[PDB]
Amino acid sequence: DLADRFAELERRYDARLGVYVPATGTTAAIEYRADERFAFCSTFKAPLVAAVLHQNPLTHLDKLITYTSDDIRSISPVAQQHVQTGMTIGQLCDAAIRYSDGTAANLLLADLGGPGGGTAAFTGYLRSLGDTVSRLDAEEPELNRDPPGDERDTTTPHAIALVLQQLVLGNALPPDKRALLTDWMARNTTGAKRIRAGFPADWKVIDKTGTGDYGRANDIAVVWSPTGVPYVVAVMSDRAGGGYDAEPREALLAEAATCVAGVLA
Amino acid sequence: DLADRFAELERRYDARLGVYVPATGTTAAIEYRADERFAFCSTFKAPLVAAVLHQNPLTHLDKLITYTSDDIRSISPVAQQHVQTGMTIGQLCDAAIRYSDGTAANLLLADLGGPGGGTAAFTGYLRSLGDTVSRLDAEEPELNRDPPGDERDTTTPHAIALVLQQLVLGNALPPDKRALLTDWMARNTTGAKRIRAGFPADWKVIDKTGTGDYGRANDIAVVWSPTGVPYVVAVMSDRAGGGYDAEPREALLAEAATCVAGVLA
Amino acid sequence: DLADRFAELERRYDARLGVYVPATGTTAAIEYRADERFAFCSTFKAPLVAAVLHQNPLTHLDKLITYTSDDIRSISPVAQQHVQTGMTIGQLCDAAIRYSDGTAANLLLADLGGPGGGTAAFTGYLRSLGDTVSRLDAEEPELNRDPPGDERDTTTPHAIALVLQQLVLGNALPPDKRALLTDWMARNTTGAKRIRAGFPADWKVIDKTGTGDYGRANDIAVVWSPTGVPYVVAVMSDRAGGGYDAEPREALLAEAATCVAGVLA
Amino acid sequence: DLADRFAELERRYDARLGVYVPATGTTAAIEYRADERFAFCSTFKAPLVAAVLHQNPLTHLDKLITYTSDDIRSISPVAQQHVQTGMTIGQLCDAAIRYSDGTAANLLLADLGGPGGGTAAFTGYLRSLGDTVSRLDAEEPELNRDPPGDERDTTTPHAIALVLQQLVLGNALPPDKRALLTDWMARNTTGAKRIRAGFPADWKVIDKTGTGDYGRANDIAVVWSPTGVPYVVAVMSDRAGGGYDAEPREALLAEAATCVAGVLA
Ligand SMILES: *C(=O)/C=C/N[C@@H](C(=O)O)C(C)(C)S(=O)O
Ligand SMILES: *C(=O)/C=C/N[C@@H](C(=O)O)C(C)(C)S(=O)O
């Protein structure tokens, strides 16, 4: 039984593990705490980019956004370099996915517009994909430091996996805009030690990671078998019992991904 | 419950699959047709080098062996290049392991001495290691085209795994000679699409492959988890029912190796 | 006579190329704009690690350095992942060389101490090696955006080649610390399409790349012939005339490296 | 210029070097002893295969050829294994190119028919390509042991290069047969340490090697620049005066190929 290995990995790493792989036409669905709530962390930046692409034409990517040093509040290796020149919506998209730039996500949230800096509009976009569970309430970096048990800024492996399936595999975006999202996730630089490290090399892997306090470590991914069969793999975890400053364990997400690959083989 | 995937792979590839992983101190042993006989093929070249290392001092590796054009009876990518210069016993070991050189193996068997060109002496070495099942009767390339049902030149995944464990992990060789065999298998060039391809990249893999007629494809390996735990993986397969000219399916060994990695994670 | 191909490559790529290979005991020195100033870019991280290694004992590499999210000011593929756990001086060295981590370089400069966050101390280390040309004035990522004609954060291929020669080939470091620098540059991950791509596969290549605005592309390397003769190859280039957003051309450095290989053969 | 490096390599490796690169539309021709005669050695098997394709229909490749153990005269790693089942002309082609099989070459020469075991027919095919210099007089392995100064079984780097140019790049064969020849040379197993070893990895290389007595070592190849520009590189060498049992030096051909790569960069 596979759920025995997941609970074994939970005990070995002193964490709570959540795994969901939507069932394909050939294989069954993998579930472990799939309907339990985990914090979004940086993984929300993937459907955030799709939200801007969905509501705006392709020419919107050339719009230049100027910002001040007071807007830099989270880890922003790209936004800190263009404070004087500004960045276009396209560059904010590239930074929000590949480098998980915090303020780039906050600026994209503002581009969604609406109350709460665009968090209300963002959750509304998740509702259009049929997801009535996830919700974003804060901006960066507050959405990462919510206490355990709090439902604000949380999703579930079941909910986030099906969202990612419609965006990459489904037609929730036209193919011209769908290709831009996939290329950003394919050249991601922040998830080399997670789902990518758990699957063999001849498996294609695109992903968007997430890390927060309380030992939070997420990774939502779309993998391709060596023959070309696509799957959706949502792996999230936290270590609330270890405290606020608990260290996240990337090895947990990598070990769990290898268990998923063994079943899909 | 892992053997359900193995039987699914046998039906998917039209082949007979044999898998054995010796049990460690923490995990149990993986077995699938583990006590059924498969053809040695070139996998016998790994304990053959260990046999030469065991019976001779380290200075014996500098002995130069000369051979004629009539000795090149099989694919010999390294021995074919030094017919004028000759090759030392050390170079014959390197070619027999890394490039699976046939003529290098035949000369090493002759260096063992005894009846049948040293095939009796080689089997005698396996008997001293506790292997009471395997047997080598022919040389290259006759040992690769034995008819199905014939027990000549055959081993079992159970037997070959335990031999490899004693040679690499156990103390069947002194550490100075143990390091030579491990380094040769570490730089193998013929098995990139088998056990190496089924395991994630952060796993260290040393191996010696084997391929013959009747769709035969073997790969004996020693893998190391990212934390440093060693395991022994013996995967063998044939497609005898498909005839003498049956094509081997390397994807079968890679898929089976991925299933093993999920259990060992 | 080799400089005819170099000027032909400059015309083909619309760039300014700088090449220098210090003369060995058998061959003469290769020079092309060798005494012209090019921007340091990330090449300064190689002698920066050597500077830290020189001034501290080997046990100093275990000192844990803590940093905040505001320190992540540039592309930092390793520093972004250990903001909560912190990184040791040894890990900062590995990240600054192999992954060209920006924040790791800034922290190592702070460990050097002195004015301007340690840029003055770094320039002082180059002066002790006989380099009276180079100079580091800013930190990451400002040192890459300097305008053309400005001497700040610039070296010359003549100067950087002799610095790299003393660190790797000379005894400017004790062998225990010298071996650490060589192994880190040998496992570099950012320069597979530059000098490494210009040399045949049987040539060992260690290097540290550098890329910035104005189409800047540098690569300082130490290569070994298949027989074991070491050489030092310093290749730098920019396209300042193309503007700030000029695209760097890695093919120029790979082609220039191939021309040098023909001479050293 | 460049011919000084060739004379430097000749004096260093104690050999006689012959290099020819047919001029392209952009580059000039490389010549060094290009019109001097070197022994064909195994390089004649490349235009030999093209000869069978040219005068025979595609169905001729399925014709089964039977042979006895008395026909195995030269190094035949593939012909030694099929002395009972026999091999088709197509299998004889694959063995003659990729593994430089001796008996495979003699059987194809006999398939050409005519006087002298088909050597007269083979030279006649070379004459139709405009080559009035080369000539084949013996079979394997006699064609390799001719004394120096003897014009039997010899070609020139100028003559063999232009033949290879029409066979691979030109339309001396229809594309249906031209693709078969190119794929066989691309999967060659006997020339990894010659022209292939002298060019960088991002250069594609197909070749057919040749080795004989008197330290003879040839390699005719077709290389492709990383952008896709094809060239023809003919490198031949012997070491007359060193005796019949003189050792061939593969490093000479690899070093000379690096000099060619430096010019074409
Ligand atoms: C090891 O098992 C192989 C020797 N050669 C094989 C190969 O695939 O190269 C064969 C099957 C061609 S063989 O020599 O019977
Ligand atoms: C080495 O010091 C530089 C790296 N510079 C660039 C990079 O490739 O990461 C940037 C993006 C930091 S830059 O010059 O704005």
Ligand SMILES: CC1(C)[C@H](C(=O)O)N2C(=O)C[C@H]2S1(=O)=O
């Ligand atoms: C919230 C973060 C600043 C930022 C983030 O997820 O936005 N994280 C990393 O790069 C790890 C976690 S974090 O440091 O908590």
Ligand SMILES: CC1(C)[C@H](C(=O)O)N2C(=O)C[C@H]2S1(=O)=O
């Ligand atoms: C048979 C060869 C192709 C070639 C030959 O004789 O044609 N030989 C040498 O010079 C040694 C053997 S070989 O290289 O295998």
